[PDB]
Design an enzyme around this catalytic site. Structure first.
Site, PDB file in Angstrom:
ATOM      1  N   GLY C  68      -8.656  72.144  -1.618  1.00 46.78           N
ATOM      2  CA  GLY C  68      -7.873  73.164  -0.965  1.00 46.78           C
ATOM      3  C   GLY C  68      -7.433  72.745   0.408  1.00 46.78           C
ATOM      4  N   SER C  97     -12.717  67.032  -3.079  1.00 46.26           N
ATOM      5  CA  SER C  97     -11.944  67.083  -1.871  1.00 46.26           C
ATOM      6  C   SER C  97     -12.591  67.946  -0.848  1.00 46.26           C
ATOM      7  CB  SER C  97     -10.603  67.627  -2.188  1.00 46.26           C
ATOM      8  OG  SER C  97      -9.772  67.460  -1.130  1.00 46.26           O
ATOM      9  N   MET C  98     -11.920  68.994  -0.434  1.00 49.54           N
ATOM     10  CA  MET C  98     -12.532  69.860   0.539  1.00 49.54           C
ATOM     11  C   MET C  98     -13.771  70.493  -0.026  1.00 49.54           C
ATOM     12  SD  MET C  98     -12.304  70.609   3.524  1.00 49.54           S
ATOM     13  CE  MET C  98     -12.869  71.540   4.855  1.00 49.54           C
ATOM     14  N   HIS C 122     -11.820  62.160  -0.993  1.00 53.89           N
ATOM     15  CA  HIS C 122     -10.590  61.424  -0.723  1.00 53.89           C
ATOM     16  C   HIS C 122      -9.933  61.845   0.582  1.00 53.89           C
ATOM     17  CE1 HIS C 122      -7.622  64.602  -1.460  1.00 53.89           C
ATOM     18  NE2 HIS C 122      -8.420  65.025  -2.422  1.00 53.89           N
ATOM     19  N   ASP C 171      -9.123  58.140  -4.324  1.00 54.12           N
ATOM     20  CA  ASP C 171     -10.025  59.096  -4.910  1.00 54.12           C
ATOM     21  C   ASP C 171     -11.255  58.433  -5.433  1.00 54.12           C
ATOM     22  OD1 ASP C 171      -7.903  60.503  -4.589  1.00 54.12           O
ATOM     23  OD2 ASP C 171      -7.392  60.796  -6.609  1.00 54.12           O
TER      24      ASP C 171
END
Lengths: 177, 192, 192, 192, 192, 192, 192, 192, 177
Positions: C68, C97-98, C122, C171
């Protein structure tokens, strides 16, 4: 209880009330005064918004909601007492000091209060919200408590008088004999 | 559960609150997302409501907002200055554009920013289509707003006006410590 | 009836709470789906609410999220560090991610993932169209964020900064045991 | 009134619950439609909730699902394995793909399908566009999942890994008697 | 007020219920519109709910439906044959396709149809795009469903299988008297 | 506020109710807008509900409808004929097509309409795409329906069948006085 | 929060009522926006409801409407004439087309219009696509409706029919004073 | 929880009221966003409601509105002039077009405006497609409205009509101090 | 009232009820019989739907939903007293007829009531929801109104053989004597 007000409809209108033996009370030479705090809780409430609203129309809601129209329509008047002004407080303070002076005179002592001391007490005790009611407490704490100690433990008994004055540095009161 | 319910022990009973109502009781208002008329209108209502409940206590405005409509933001800005209690603002996430504008508008000494939050400031955007004379009118109005916004930034941050004008010609990003030095906020909250 | 109600007994027994509120009552907060501002705004409100309820009782944050907005996520990040009680983060499904970022931000020793969770990390994504001058401003802005995220990952995971930077270039997927070795989490929950 | 209300007597009898909540009280959870994150976060909340209510009683999970996101399905998959009470999975309608995966994951001896149901299994789907370097990373990521999915199927069905691997290359449909023979389920419920 | 409330006297007589909930209380379930998964899941929940309330009383299923997804319909089909109490199905409006399939599946002797209703039967529809190998798999899958559907029709109607096989080749419409003669329903309800 | 609440004092209290539920208590049902399955399904539920409340009292059906799906309308049509109490149908606004069909289906002597209403009747519409064989099947079915509707019109209006056959080939509009002469309604309501 | 609640003391308590219900209680009905079937249906329900509560007291209909469907409007029109108490109509904002039609239909002497409101009248609109034969049928029906509306305008306004015929040829706007002279309303309200 | 609840203690106990209802009790009405029919219909209802509650107290109308439909705005305009208590209008954010029109319509001496708010005035907009004859009719009506609005502006502001006529030719923006000098408002609220 | 219910439970638990004069009633020697009609009200209700269903219930469950378990647990039993069969309602009508005849015997009137009349009155008076209760009224009016009239009018005498045949329409085919 609001039904008790119904007893006054015939009093206010015909000057009479009949007891349980059938005898009639005669109120034609009686001044009828009823006091109330209706509407005050509302008049003293702060509104929500950018502009403070004028809540003086307490008469339009609480008095009207509490007293049935037939009751109200029999009154000579509904009179709104105001909050006391500061000018009044000064007069109230003078009045209360006189009451104090009388109680003291009865014990053989007397009291003088300077004008500065009086203005100070008036300024200190004023609270628009509680009318003249707290002024008696301000006097009770600033003049009566000191005096009771002087009267009760011998400092100010037979043979003396007390003078109270305000200093300027602390705005504290003086006492004496 | 779009929004969770909580219950509180007080006197008469637990009732329930949906978090945001629960926090409104603690004098905390959340400003998030774009500033627009309806959301701004709701914040103003909340601040007026809190001002009345207790004029002597601070109101906390949590800001996490990318920006928005100046006009709408302007109604929030004026309410904050008008009402008696200090409004303390806290920047979390971001305070960009109009969000940054409102962030600095909190009571001095009470503008706080969390450590990893970003504050962004820039001159106002707008536009207009129409006759050359209609363009002329609207161009003057946006410029008056720009001038007015710069005047308020300088007032609240302590920066000279000349410095504010230079610094907002292009988007400027400030990290929490940069915001403190610049004067957008007074301090950084770290740990309780 | 998308979200079921559950009934709990007390004294009188009159308690009917949406199942997510029933869980908030147990100090459990769920972060799922994209990290955005309204979601984040609600999680922060819930954590502050729990912090006040009992400042000495862990808060459990269940994470199942693809990622997000960083800005929104940082308001969760900062609140978690600010508040007094430990926040124990549990990764189920995924933390990408977040989401991964917040997973590792939980209290040390209390970060863990169910056996089949995936965690993915990432570098930040973003972009911007405009004049070369504005591109330059925004490009610097995203690089600072990248640098800032890199520092926080290193802080929380124990990896050196250089290593954490290399590993987020592309990633990187980690299985639950890989996340443990890497240091994204402390352990794996298995069975009751 | 999309979801009807039901009334249940207690003491006072002041209970009105949407039918979904009423059945949760009987320890019945329905998993239907696509498996995604928001839905497979409610299934989890319900299972955790039931585990606490009575750790010693079975939870009945009704499955009627075409498949879904593996990640979302795994939070369900792990919760079922983690919690204490047996989760008995019942297949009605269909259990395809991720749905079949969860069906076989129920407690051994308690997995069953209504007689006209259909169970379908097949290797995971996915995809990714980008640079050849990123493609390799993502391709590696889906193959690890495929491998992991195959190990768990073999574990729960009793099929060798080599056999389960062959049987999922292409969609394989199994009738309820076939699911039993194969080992996806233990039996067929016929009549109560 | 799309769905009106009704009030019913009891002992206290305080209960109000969406008219559909009022009817669920009388063991009446309405199946309308397309048969899909969410609808079917709700019907199944209602049947399980009624089975639990009183296993010894009939459940009335009102059908007014153009058809729908077979898989979804089969979850209703199997629940009806699983739960202990008889399910008495009533056709009003129409029972087409899967709707007819469920209509005939009601308890023998209790399958009713209002006199101006229509019942339509026809082989299953479906389709698939993919490699020739996958096409074969899916084609085999639909033919098995067709065959299975033909076997159940013959079972419930008393028609030979060969006769069912011929009669569903093309859409076949039956008037209520034809449905009775054919064996899809036992009788026609006319007047109370 | 789309539907205003009303209150009524009976025994111990007010019981507010959506004005639509308040009228259901008076045995008044409104049928408005298109006749479709969900609407029709709800009207039937209301009629069954009222029939049970008091089998000996009339149900008033207010019709203001442009027409709709025949099947859905027949669901209503058959319930009105089945249930014990008379259904008195009142036309306001318009009763077109299937709406007119239901209007005439009310209890004889109790069918009435307001002075400026309009009633419109016509043969059924429909269509089909597909193989000539299926076209033949579907065309035949719509014709059977037309014939069936023609008989019911003749039954309820007293017109010969051939007269109905001719009158509905093309849309026919009838003013309230013509509906009376034609036999669609028994009378016109004027003033109380 | 679109519509606020208001609280009024009654007898034994006080009641919270949607402001729209609070006004229905005072026999005030608001007709706004386009006249269509669902809204018209609701106004009719409200008028019947008020007629029953007190058949001897006037009903006030506030109109602020651009027009709408004639059929829907006629059901309102007929109910107003049918019910016993006078319906006093008040035009605020605008009463155009069908709105104007209903405005003049109020009780004579009680049709009021605010000072800056605009009333607009014009022949009915409509249209049709189809065979020349169907066009002919539909053209005649709209003309009959036009004639019928012209007759009712003349009745309620006191204008000759010929004069109404001319004045509705094309949209004719009337200011509040013009509405009074024309006879659409009896008077203009100004200040209380 | 889009709109928070607030709680206040009165007589018997505490009442929970949407914050918007809580402020209606204080005789505060908000007009924000576009002026349209439904919004006006509601504001008028609120003003009539407050007028009845206490005819002798001011009603505060908060305006933050870009403009809207003249017709809808006039119903607000007329209600304000009609009802007995003064309506005091306060401009926050913006009062543009129709919004400015209503702002100046407040009671004389009570038109207030926050210091950073903008007021904008202009001649009315509109348009029409059709035959040259209809174009004339509609052109004639918009000009009458323009003239009518011009008169009311002059009446309320004290500007001569000719001056108003000139000043609304093109959009004119006024800052709060300009609105005061012009006479649109009486004063600026600054700080409590 | 719930406080009757509560006092009965207190008696069930301790054997006694205490009077305002301090006197105690001792229930150790008594049998408490309580009656209820709860289990017959539900079964007479018609269901909503095209097919009426069987609303027969378990009367014991109806009691469970009305009464508390504290009450039920202090009972020796809850017993269902069922509806009456045809021969029972005949025994009831015959008892009533015999009582009628006793009154007629006091006058000396002999009333023959046919078997068809006996069956019919039993069937007509009996209501399975109200049992034999209404039998009092089917006999009080059908078998007495005509006798009172012939006797009071004087067409019937103190003696005489009066009979009532029942016809196919179930009418009382009464006679003189």
């Amino acid at each position: 209880h609001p039904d008790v007000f119904n007893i006054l409809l015939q009093v206010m209108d015909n000057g009479t009330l009949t007891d349980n033996n059938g005898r009639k009370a005669d109120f034609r030479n009686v001044v009828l005064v009823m006091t109330t705090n209706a509407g005050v809780r509302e008049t003293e409430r702060k509104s929500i918004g950018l502009i403070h609203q004028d809540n003086s129309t307490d008469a339009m809601e609480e008095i009207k909601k509490i007293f049935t129209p037939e009751f109200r329509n029999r009154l000579d008047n509904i009179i709104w007492f105001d909050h006391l002004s500061t000018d009044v407080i000064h007069q109230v303070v003078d009045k209360f000091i006189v009451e104090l002076q009388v109680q003291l005179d009865q014990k053989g002592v007397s009291l003088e209060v300077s004008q500065e001391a009086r203005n100070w007490l008036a300024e200190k005790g004023y609270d628009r919200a509680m009318g003249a009611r707290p002024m008696a407490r301000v006097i009770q704490d600033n003049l009566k408590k000191p005096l009771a100690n002087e009267l009760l433990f011998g400092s100010l008994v037979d043979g003396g008088q007390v003078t109270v004055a305000l200093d300027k540095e602390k705005n504290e009161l003086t006492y004496g004999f | 559960a779009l929004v969770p319910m909580v219950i509180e022990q007080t006197s008469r009973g637990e009732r329930s609150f949906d978090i945001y109502s629960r926090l409104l009781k603690e004098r905390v208002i959340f400003l998030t997302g774009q500033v627009e008329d309806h959301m701004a209108n709701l914040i103003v209502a909340q601040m007026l409501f809190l001002e009345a409940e207790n004029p002597e206590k601070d109101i906390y405005l949590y800001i996490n907002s990318p920006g928005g409509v100046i006009t709408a933001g302007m109604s929030i800005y004026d309410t904050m200055q008008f009402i008696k209690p200090d409004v303390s603002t806290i920047c979390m996430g971001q305070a960009a554009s109009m969000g940054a504008f409102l962030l600095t508008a909190g009571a001095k000494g009470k503008r706080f920013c969390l450590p990893n939050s970003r504050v962004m400031i820039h001159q106002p955007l707008g536009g207009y289509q129409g006759q050359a004379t209609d363009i002329e009118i609207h161009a003057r109005e946006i410029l008056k707003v720009k001038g007015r916004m710069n005047e308020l930034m300088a007032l609240h941050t302590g920066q000279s006006l000349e410095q504010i004008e230079r610094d907002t010609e292009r988007d400027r990003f400030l990290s929490a410590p940069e915001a403190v030095e610049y004067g957008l906020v007074d301090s950084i909250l770290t740990h309780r």
